[PDB]
Design a protein around this ligand. Structure first.
Ligand SMILES: [Zn+2]
Ligand SMILES: [Zn+2]
Lengths: 536, 75
């Protein structure tokens, strides 16, 4: 927009002449000066743009779309003016002026262009304002003054004016902007938290009280608390990672903290009190539990923990058996599962491993040793489940018609139907074989049932499907014998293999033809252009 | 992913295991030795979150059309 260069060069000179005497942006005076400079620069820019400062709609407090020009030179939303001027209030709410005829005169050449220019200018101003407050106020490790922190925190509010009240702005030093939803950002919180936690407790506590008193009186404060905990834990993570420190000193620091953790669970508990000290404490214990989860994963993968990390794990176990807040144990087990998987905690849910202390008391008392694996094939949904349940029922009994009846009572024709049938067969045989109690169940006069079903049902009597079925039913298929050693990814790799084999067999698509050639005709792929390889 | 996670969590041969409840999407209120309901002790708060890694940044930059918006970070 080549229509603001002279004014902004004048403002460049103005900010230069007011910057020599205070070349320290960390205090309040230059922040206030530059805020006023940006504000009156926006005002003068709008004045030069669109005939002395076009204002937002008075009702929604935001920019007006499809502008309608009142005789008193007022810009209101077309929706707001159409839903507000229809009853017996034919008068401009701002200056109290009666509109003669109707909201008919609209301008399609002037107001919209000025509005878009104002939006662009305000976007750049706000963006580099938050850029400066992130940079100029945070050049070094020295915390800024209290006054500038107070000003930047109070800038967010749109407090009571003549008429919703008490919104929250995205660091905009201007007033012609609103969000008609109280939303709390974390950029100011994060910027405050980059400093040491000891020197910013008052500011974050004041902001918390302000948002609890005017933004989140009675609402879902759980999201707010988890957001603040995440921000605090990210801040301490950055402080630990960026700083020049080893692992043994932080290990002993965390061990001492856990040993010196006074419970204090009754202080900020009941309904409303959430001290920033308690948020720091919960973030710290969550980080400690994440470290313990990593140590347990390493112990499962490898040898002992060099007698030092074992001390940290012992302190964690003493903490868990000392405090009754099992929510921390739930967080620890969730982190362990997210790091490795469910089979990790299933192996840890055995009957005497020296890690049962990481599990609650009721989770081990009534857990049997028949804890199996789940079928990860539920991606289909509502139809693979039915056919697999019918297949399991046919496995339990000798009748084999239930699976066919369920198959013929569904949509998703022959390709995906055969995929479902073969996958259910594989899942049933794998579940029977892996479980030692029911080993070789189809061979107990039940393989004749499935064989008669294959001979009777022509929905899968394809020679390739027939050979796959006969290989899979008697466990002669060369995928089960992967002879892995980790005993964790053996089943996963085998099930990837069997699922891709079933997909290729049942995928009768042109793109799947080369994949079929690779997975079933290797002799023809002798000296062939194998994909996903580097080229010069 | 949430839909398949919820459906798999409801499978009626692993849900019998109490371990998968405190793991695969069931609030831990069913554990008797628990503190009372608290605004800070919500089930969502005590859940697990991700660890931001540059490969996740790669996913964000490729999935949000970083070819022309922010290509320098992409490279
Ligand atoms: Zn007016
Ligand atoms: Zn409006």
């Amino acid at each position: 927009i080549p229509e603001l260069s002279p004014l902004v060069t004048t403002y460049v000179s103005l900010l230069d002449k007011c910057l020599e005497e205070d070349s320290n942006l960390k205090t309040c005076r230059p922040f206030v000066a530059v805020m006023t400079t940006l504000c009156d620069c926006k005002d003068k820019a709008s004045k030069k743009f669109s005939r002395f400062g076009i204002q937002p709609c008075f009702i929604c407090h935001g920019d007006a779309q499809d502008p309608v020009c009142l005789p008193c030179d007022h810009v209101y939303c077309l929706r707001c003016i159409q839903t507000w001027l229809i009853p017996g209030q034919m008068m401009c709410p701002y200056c109290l002026t009666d509109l003669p005829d109707k909201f008919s005169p609209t301008v399609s050449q002037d107001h919209r262009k000025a509005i878009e220019k104002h939006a662009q200018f305000r976007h750049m101003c706000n963006s580099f304002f938050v850029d400066l407050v992130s940079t100029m106020c945070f050049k070094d490790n020295t915390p800024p003054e209290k006054s500038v922190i107070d000003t930047l925190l109070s800038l967010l509010f749109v407090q009571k004016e003549l008429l919703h009240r008490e919104h929250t702005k995205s660091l905009s030093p201007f007033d012609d902007v609103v969000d008609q939803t109280p939303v709390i950002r974390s950029v100011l919180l994060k910027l405050l938290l980059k400093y040491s936690f000891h020197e910013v407790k008052d500011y974050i506590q004041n902001y918390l009280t302000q948002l609890e008193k005017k933004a989140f009186l009675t609402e879902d404060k759980t999201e707010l608390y988890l957001l603040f905990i995440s921000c605090l834990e990210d801040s301490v993570h950055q402080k630990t990672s960026a700083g020049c420190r080893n692992l043994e000193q932080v290990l002993r620091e965390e061990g001492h903290f856990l040993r010196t953790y006074s419970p204090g669970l009754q202080g900020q508990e009941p309904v409303r009190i959430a001290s920033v000290e308690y948020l720091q404490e919960v973030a710290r214990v969550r980080l400690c539990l994440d470290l313990a989860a990593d140590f347990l994963s390493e112990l499962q993968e490898g040898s002992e923990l060099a007698e030092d990390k074992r001390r940290f794990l012992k302190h964690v176990e003493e903490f868990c058996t000392r405090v009754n807040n099992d929510w921390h144990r739930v967080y620890l087990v969730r982190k362990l599962s997210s790091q490795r998987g469910m089979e990790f905690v299933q192996s840890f849910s055995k009957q005497g491993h020296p890690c049962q202390w990481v599990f609650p008391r009721k989770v081990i008392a009534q857990q049997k040793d028949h804890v199996s694996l789940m079928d990860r094939y539920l991606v289909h949904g509502n139809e693979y489940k039915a056919v697999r349940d019918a297949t399991a029922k046919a496995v339990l009994e000798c009748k084999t018609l239930d699976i066919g009846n369920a198959l013929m009572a569904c949509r998703s024709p022959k390709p995906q139907q055969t995929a479902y049938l073969l996958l259910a067969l594989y899942t049933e045989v794998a579940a029977l074989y892996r479980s030692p109690n029911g080993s070789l169940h189809p061979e107990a006069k039940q393989l004749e049932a499935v064989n008669k079903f294959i001979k009777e049902s022509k929905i899968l009597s394809d020679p390739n499907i027939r050979c796959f079925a006969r290989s899979l039913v008697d466990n002669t298929l060369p995928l089960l014998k992967i002879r892995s050693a980790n005993s964790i990814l053996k089943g996963t790799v085998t099930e990837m293999a069997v699922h891709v084999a079933t997909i290729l067999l049942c995928g009768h698509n042109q793109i799947l033809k080369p994949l079929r050639n690779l997975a079933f005709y290797p002799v023809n792929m002798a000296n062939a252009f194998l994909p996903t390889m580097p080229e010069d | 992913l949430p839909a398949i996670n919820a459906l798999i969590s409801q499978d009626e041969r692993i849900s019998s295991n109490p371990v998968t409840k405190i793991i695969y999407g069931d609030p831990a209120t069913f554990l008797p030795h628990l503190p009372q309901k608290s605004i800070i002790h919500c089930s969502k708060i005590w859940s697990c979150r991700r660890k931001i890694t540059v490969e996740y940044l790669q996913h964000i930059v490729e999935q949000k059309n970083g070819k022309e918006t922010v290509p320098v970070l992409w490279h």
